[PDB]
Symmetry: D2
Amino acid sequence: HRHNTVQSVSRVYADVLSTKPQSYWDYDDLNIKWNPQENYEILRKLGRGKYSEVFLGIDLEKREKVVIKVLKPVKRKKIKREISILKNLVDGPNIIAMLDVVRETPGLIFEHINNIDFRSLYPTFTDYDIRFYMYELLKALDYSHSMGIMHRDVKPHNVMIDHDKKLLRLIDWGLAEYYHPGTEYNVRVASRYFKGPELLVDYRLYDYSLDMWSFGCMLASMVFMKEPFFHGKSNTDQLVQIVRVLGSKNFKKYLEKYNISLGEEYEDIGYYNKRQWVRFMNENNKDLVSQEFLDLIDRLLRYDHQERLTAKEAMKHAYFDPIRVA
Amino acid sequence: RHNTVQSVSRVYADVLSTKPQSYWDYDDLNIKWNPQENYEILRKLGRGKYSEVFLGIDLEKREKVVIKVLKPVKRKKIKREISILKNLVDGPNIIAMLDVVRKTPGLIFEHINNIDFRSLYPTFTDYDIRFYMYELLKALDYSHSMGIMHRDVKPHNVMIDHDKKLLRLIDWGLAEYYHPGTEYNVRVASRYFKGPELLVDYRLYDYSLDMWSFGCMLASMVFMKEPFFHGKSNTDQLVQIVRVLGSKNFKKYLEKYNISLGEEYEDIGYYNKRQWVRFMNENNKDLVSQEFLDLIDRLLRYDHQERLTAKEAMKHAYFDPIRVA
Amino acid sequence: RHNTVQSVSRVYADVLSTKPQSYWDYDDLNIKWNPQENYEILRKLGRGKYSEVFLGIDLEKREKVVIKVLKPVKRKKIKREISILKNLVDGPNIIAMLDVVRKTPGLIFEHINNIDFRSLYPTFTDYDIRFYMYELLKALDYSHSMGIMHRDVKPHNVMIDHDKKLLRLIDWGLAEYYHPGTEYNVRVASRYFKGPELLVDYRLYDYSLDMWSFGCMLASMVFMKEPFFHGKSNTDQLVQIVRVLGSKNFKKYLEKYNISLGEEYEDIGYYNKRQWVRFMNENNKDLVSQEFLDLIDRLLRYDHQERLTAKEAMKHAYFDPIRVA
Amino acid sequence: HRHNTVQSVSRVYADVLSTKPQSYWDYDDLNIKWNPQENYEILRKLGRGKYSEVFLGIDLEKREKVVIKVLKPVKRKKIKREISILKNLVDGPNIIAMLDVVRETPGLIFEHINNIDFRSLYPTFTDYDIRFYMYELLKALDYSHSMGIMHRDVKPHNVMIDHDKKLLRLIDWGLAEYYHPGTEYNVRVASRYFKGPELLVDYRLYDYSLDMWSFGCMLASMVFMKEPFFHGKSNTDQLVQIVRVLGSKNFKKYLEKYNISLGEEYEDIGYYNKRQWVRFMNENNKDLVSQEFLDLIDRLLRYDHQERLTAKEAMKHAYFDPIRVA
Ligand SMILES: Nc1ncnc2c1ncn2[C@@H]1O[C@H](COP(=O)(O)O)[C@@H](O)[C@H]1O
Ligand SMILES: Nc1ncnc2c1ncn2[C@@H]1O[C@H](COP(=O)(O)O)[C@@H](O)[C@H]1O
Ligand SMILES: Nc1ncnc2c1ncn2[C@@H]1O[C@H](COP(=O)(O)O)[C@@H](O)[C@H]1O
Ligand SMILES: Nc1ncnc2c1ncn2[C@@H]1O[C@H](COP(=O)(O)O)[C@@H](O)[C@H]1O
Ligand SMILES: [Cl-]
Ligand SMILES: [Cl-]
Ligand SMILES: [Cl-]
Ligand SMILES: [Cl-]
Ligand SMILES: [Cl-]
Ligand SMILES: [Cl-]
Ligand SMILES: [Cl-]
Ligand SMILES: [Cl-]
Ligand SMILES: [Cl-]
Ligand SMILES: [Cl-]
Ligand SMILES: [Cl-]
Ligand SMILES: [Cl-]
Ligand SMILES: [Cl-]
Ligand SMILES: [Cl-]
Ligand SMILES: [Cl-]
Ligand SMILES: [Cl-]
């Protein structure tokens, strides 16, 4: 007994990839047909990871602004995986639009969003600005989940917002992966402040519920005015900050339910009792904190990835009633 | 004159005292007219008792404009509307009169892409109502701070481009400068949004008339009932107002201003005041908040002096989920 | 069938040979209808012999949309228009049919803010004519490259938002897929923009019919004379065409296709061909360029085969001051 | 005889400042009433001179994008001069809009223009894109000239263009100065590639004609596809590149007409004959070069600042006929 036989299957959108052609999910055999690259000239470097280098660009023929993303030519399966996902989510709500793909180092052309950084735009948000833009983020998450794709990197950095147009786009799909039921995925995904408990205990049978925990970490940070909500120094300490809030009783139960072998590096985790979400409320965030929010955030930040609210169920929560169009 | 109990606006009463005679003297104004051929008519927009509104084209800019041509029977009033639109050019959510042209005079307004109110308002959320009415309060507070009453606040005169989240208050033909101690014509605004001061012929009103008209718009949008005060006439309009606000506060309102009432309501009854929460049904319960009931109670009042001013309404806790301040 | 001299499009003839039967078989199509209550009617836009167009509201998006409701007398044709609009969703300057709804069927189109043509076109510069007609050629070349003739190119079917420099070709009810060797109904397009092939009952036409309609639009915009071929009827429409293009080239056109002419033009005269520069007066001399006269001569021709294709017209030197390529 | 008595007066807009109140042109006694500065937060530094430092900003209350320009607190007359000119040209065609002024180092808040740099957007221009945007630049120049203000720094850097909206704005008024007839101004204005001959020979009695020469240097560069048109290594060599094209006969005449004492540092300037503007035409720029352009550029790049075309006269030239709305 090496693999785990106690296994999880997504409650929603479990078998959507089985109803699509092989060319949809088989990104390794995708055939990218490249367009001329001199139709786009680099203006300014927006930033860089070490998997990528994004720039501000010019569609020399269309003379609009676009964002070019030069990928490292060291990996191809990850390269064609991102192009595969963006091409499938081309007509999705609040999904970043991929306009072209060039080479001669593959370059991916995205639409430019006149956005403002998150460390400055969010502190200016009101109560209904949070409920609105998060609902728009749920629209993008629910679509790709319905298309068998989990983002696996939901964070305020990867969420562009054009507040002048009330526009939101979810970007950075380099970590997104297709969901086949029963698949064991890499746990080294997302970022520390938004990693789910399944990633910190090395439970590889996760589904779209991963993007849901990162969404809860975002919503809890903006409403409670604490960035990040779970502030951990390490991946080991990140789980401690989660057990500190959700308690140890439900954590050990989450492990016994899915028979997760918790490495005894987490033995130093002591007894923690579950806290009330109301304890994080102060004079600054008291207008953003509501009874509807405290209920929604309680059903989002769960150990059990199956008992968490789906993107569609979160949209129907009463917390978005003052903004939902009927 | 006309002997009556006096009343002065408790706010923005001495604004015109701080401005030259050039500001409010709308008859001394000399208008520099411009050629009318720069604008052509595309589609007729709205008829009128005193004007006609069309869809226009700015032949050099080729953008969309709105032309309001007037019958020339009134010089002093025509100059009054041009005087007011020229004083509120920097006003937030105030329509921007672009030019005047020449027979008859024509006024060029900026074009706002919008959907009619009773086709757009039924789709408004709690967010949309608090956001847009706060934008409307921005226009009312500025014009009042400039010494100008609108005297015709109604959803027809509120242009909303929802795709751009814009709001523009339009139609300033019934507007007027406010000088303390001046009877204005009670034949202003429209029936469903007339204040009790217009219905009892109390002519010394002020900016608070627009606040009653604002409360009529808000109460109907929240309670989902247009109009909120459905009246057959200006006499029945008052009866429908006291049917809700009560006979007790109505008696105190007539005593404070010594209002000798008309013979027609002879058969008016004693209406016990109905609480504001009694209008909350299962269809609008999500729009009826506890802070709204406090706001709607401090706006819809007989005595115009105890009504909330525009600025006082913008600082109310009802707009907390939408206000940046 | 009907015995005649044959003709095949020299371009884009085998496009439908490269696509599945699912593409052009518009009767096998199964449409997934959607609720109509998501869209409400605000203002009626245009009447029609076969449809009615209104201004709409996308109750959830609350943006402006355009609803074209149809009489249900024709299944196969209704499916034909939906089939064509669904194949050109990525087409440049093609109108984006957003949804179909349900009695009668309704088609949701995107809304374009624009001014009527004969109020906007008189304000067009040399820049505006070359730029916008090049945008219209983008829509024609794409639909032709997709095997679809429009068969109704006219300024009424060209929506221009000049404030955003946008152009959208609309009204694809008369459109049709092109298969080589197929008589199409000569009762297409409108009188002022009908090609000579429709007027002599030559049914084996192709995409070049839209190019004659394009040349009629361009020649009138440049020479400032709408319409360029003013005809009382479809018979007089031809007489006005040969009055300019000449009887000599008309004889060669009837010989190449063995067109036995109708009895009605019995009294037609011999018109010497009038040069294209003779239409340059002092009012349009700044719009009449030397490269335009070459372009207008290679577009307005009897023989549809020798007319310029859409792509050939876009690469013409007339669009050099505006084309990026 | 120390000052010059052979003197020049603007052919147009000579006495416009005499018809405006004293508060209009007397910028030294302007009273700036500052607004709170924490309503604007700095996002990214766009660039810097050593008289200024411009940043990308956020109207925290309006949540739109603005450009903040923090001036050095070393000079005040130049500080209030720029605020004086921007406030007077507030409702001008294609003039950059000043929205607010803050302190606590004075900070000037401008409207943000979604523009693209000039070294990349101009090589994509067509024939009618040049005629259009230059006509829009003439609209801004003619307005401020009609308001008694000369920009004195017209260059492609100081011209923002939102090609997506067909929008143009003339920025950077730190060198702009009010025009009083008979005034001797500082010749150390503008930039080398666009300095007029009056600046290179130290003729201080120039008027709005200064902005006209810089406009001609811009139009000649974009049509002939040579940036810059007069490429000089120094201020002394810059005049040599001008005499190289316009000839020495008209130059010595320009000096004898206005009795300009040319420092014998320019003695090494030899005999130059006037060239034909047609000689700068090649296969690349032959579509942009037209008979109407060669006439307009010949009447713009003149030694005599009085004989140059005004901004209004340049707008009525036949070169802008295919784009001018009648
Ligand atoms: N579509 C876009 N529009 C505007 N900025 C973008 C876009 N995509 C990425 N960025 C910027 O690129 C940076 C992130 O790059 P990276 O860290 O390489 O993922 C941030 O500054 C983002 O704001
Ligand atoms: N500035 C404007 N922009 C767009 N529509 C307007 C404007 N002004 C008036 N309308 C229309 O005119 C009607 C209002 O009545 P009136 O003010 O009499 O024209 C409504 O149908 C409005 O949509
Ligand atoms: N998508 C659209 N956007 C704006 N106006 C339209 C649209 N489609 C049709 N129209 C209007 O409808 C008329 C054209 O005739 P029809 O296609 O029969 O409605 C003109 O008045 C157009 O302005
Ligand atoms: N209103 C504006 N919108 C966008 N960029 C601007 C604006 N004003 C100045 N800049 C930028 O500021 C830089 C010039 O700053 P400086 O060299 O200090 O004058 C250039 O990168 C300009 O594009
Ligand atoms: Cl499912
Ligand atoms: Cl397949
Ligand atoms: Cl373009
Ligand atoms: Cl607790
Ligand atoms: Cl005074
Ligand atoms: Cl009156
Ligand atoms: Cl009572
Ligand atoms: Cl509330
Ligand atoms: Cl097939
Ligand atoms: Cl047919
Ligand atoms: Cl002949
Ligand atoms: Cl030409
Ligand atoms: Cl003058
Ligand atoms: Cl003064
Ligand atoms: Cl806002
Ligand atoms: Cl020469």
